[PDB]
Amino acid sequence: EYPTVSEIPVGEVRLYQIADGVWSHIATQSFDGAVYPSNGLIVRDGDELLLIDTAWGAKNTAALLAEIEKQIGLPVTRAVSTHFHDDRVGGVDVLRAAGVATYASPSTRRLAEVEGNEIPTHSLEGLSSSGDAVRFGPVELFYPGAAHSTDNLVVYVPSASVLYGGCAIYELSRTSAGNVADADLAEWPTSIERIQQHYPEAQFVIPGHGLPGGLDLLKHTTNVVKAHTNR
Amino acid sequence: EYPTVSEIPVGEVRLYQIADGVWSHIATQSFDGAVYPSNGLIVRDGDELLLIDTAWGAKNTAALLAEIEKQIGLPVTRAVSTHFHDDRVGGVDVLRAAGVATYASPSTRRLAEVEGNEIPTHSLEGLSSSGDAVRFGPVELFYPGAAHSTDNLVVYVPSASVLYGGCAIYELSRTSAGNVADADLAEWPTSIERIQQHYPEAQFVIPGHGLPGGLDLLKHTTNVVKAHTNR
Ligand SMILES: O=C(CSc1n[nH]c(-c2ccccc2C(=O)O)n1)Nc1nc2ccccc2[nH]1
Ligand SMILES: O=C(CSc1n[nH]c(-c2ccccc2C(=O)O)n1)Nc1nc2ccccc2[nH]1
Ligand SMILES: [Cl-]
Ligand SMILES: [Cl-]
Ligand SMILES: [Cl-]
Ligand SMILES: [Cl-]
Ligand SMILES: [Mg+2]
Ligand SMILES: [Mg+2]
Ligand code: NA
Ligand code: NA
Ligand code: NA
Ligand code: NA
Ligand SMILES: [Zn+2]
Ligand SMILES: [Zn+2]
Ligand SMILES: [Zn+2]
Ligand SMILES: [Zn+2]
């Protein structure tokens, strides 16, 4: 039922309704001779939408906004990027040009600038220390500590018990580490345990790439990170 | 013009005619949350066909044979696997059940057995030393030395100037190393130079995965291997 790369040509975006007023958005990107999917989140906040992460690039993100406009028909007023990599901020300029207020932590904004990536305009304060949580409309933003990146955030939708782990959480089908160039392998398991301890009631867990599941995805990611550590 | 993973659902196989009586076969496989393509070769020999490498698995290889039967309509009498990994021998049992004589070097047969992979039935003698070449019907088989694997073979079709590099040769779009668990990074550039020196007249170069090109694919692979070596 969840869309895979098969049903998504490169450049198209699919939406998947997880619960009342909660969708994921799925896009694909081709690099290094393979094709990868990527997830973000959409959360209804009254008569508007909060977007979590771009669709991995300007063209994808323009298709994302067109797909939201036709399938949901509510305005995207704010967006949050969960870390500084292109699958999360690639397309921020498209969002800004459409009138979306783009947000990220100062850590993410700093790292995006150093990398030469697109930089969300607004700063999310209160997330600099591991275990920090802040409310952002219909979601909670949580900094679990360094993992996939030193800045990665996770997002929880309390009304639907949906946990969006971003790239700090792997799908079950991924049994080897992904891009860990910017990761903190030493701290990643501890950061996942902070997620587990803060959101033990989560019923739906969305990885940054691939199929959703339950809280088992946290233990799965810990297994994979530790195996990579011991390579 | 060359098929990519977009036009190939996982489980289907496409044929691409390179020249008179020379085709590549293209399949896809899901692996670790991504989709990868894979190439093999088909070379007409009189009224029969020589197959280079499986389509990466039993289902793909059954689809490969059905696609050959309907699009070319000539019998596959012999097959050669160019190294011992599953994208080259996965499906050998299907070929054997269909009456195809399967071949590999004793080095490949030895390594496949150790790995628990399918084992081609017939042995290709005369390929144990770097630089060894043997004729096999309408092609020449060449052992350039260890590279992607210690056993990898390349195949040249002299009548069409087609060089099938297998997984020792990367497509241009791949700028980072692939699966190098069984590779000899120290010897891979020297092995590529042997290919260059033996087939300087090659006009079309087929990598194990992705888009074909010219002999520049050899220098490209050297560039990528050396960069990975210096990681
Ligand atoms: O490299 C980046 C951001 S780094 C990153 N974060 N997450 C991942 C990632 C990707 C696939 C599967 C798993 C993961 C993961 O482990 O999360 N990669 N973007 C980028 N570079 C490009 C170069 C050329 C063309 C397009 C490009 N798009
Ligand atoms: O390990 C193998 C065969 S080794 C091999 N040879 N060539 C390649 C290859 C594949 C794609 C792109 C480039 C290359 C390359 O670099 O040539 N891979 N298959 C395998 N392992 C798995 C482990 C877990 C789940 C599924 C798995 N499927
Ligand atoms: Cl590839
Ligand atoms: Cl931590
Ligand atoms: Cl992936
Ligand atoms: Cl060598
Ligand atoms: Mg490739
Ligand atoms: Mg994945
Ligand atoms: Na490509
Ligand atoms: Na809102
Ligand atoms: Na023949
Ligand atoms: Na060139
Ligand atoms: Zn990332
Ligand atoms: Zn990612
Ligand atoms: Zn291989
Ligand atoms: Zn391969």
Author numbering:
A (entry chain B), B (entry chain A): 30 to 45, 47 to 64, 66 to 100, 102 to 107, 109 to 131, 133 to 150, 165 to 205, 209 to 211, ...
List passages from the publication reporting this PDB structure.
A main mechanism for bacteria to develop resistance to β-lactams is the expression of β-lactamase, which hydrolyze the β-lactam ring and renders the antibiotics ineffective. Based on amino acid sequence homology and Zn(II) content, MβLs are further divided into subclasses B1, B2, and B3. VIM-2, a B1 subclass MβL, was initially discovered in P. aeruginosa, which showed a high prelevance and broad substrate spectrum, including penicillins, cephalosporins, and carbapenems, it therefore reflects a significant drug target for the treatment of antibiotic-resistant bacterial infection. As is typical for B1 MβLs, there are two Zn(II) ions in the active sites of the enzyme.
However, only the crystal structure of VIM-2 in complex with 1b (VIM-2:1b) was obtained successfully through co-crystallization. Importantly, we found that the phenyl at R1 position formed π-π stacking with the imidazole ring of His263, the favorable hydrophobic interaction reasonably explained the SAR that the aromatic carboxyl substituted 2-triazolylthioactamides (1a–j) exhibited a better inhibitory activity against VIM-2 than the aliphatic carboxyl substituted compounds (2a–e and 3a–e). In our crystal structure, residues Trp87 kept a native pose, yet the binding of 1b to the active sites of VIM-2 resulted in a conformational change of the residue Phe61 on the L3 loop and formed a potential clash with Phe61 utilizing the benzimidazole group. Moreover, two Cl− and four Na+ ions have been observed. IC50 values of 1a–j against VIM-2 were measured in 30 mM Tris, pH 7.6, in which the concentrations of inhibitors were varied between 0 and 120 µM. The IC50 data listed in Table 1 indicated that the 2-triazolylthioactamides 1a–j inhibited VIM-2 with an IC50 value in the range 20.6–58.6 μM, and 1h was the most potent inhibitor (IC50 = 20.6 μM).
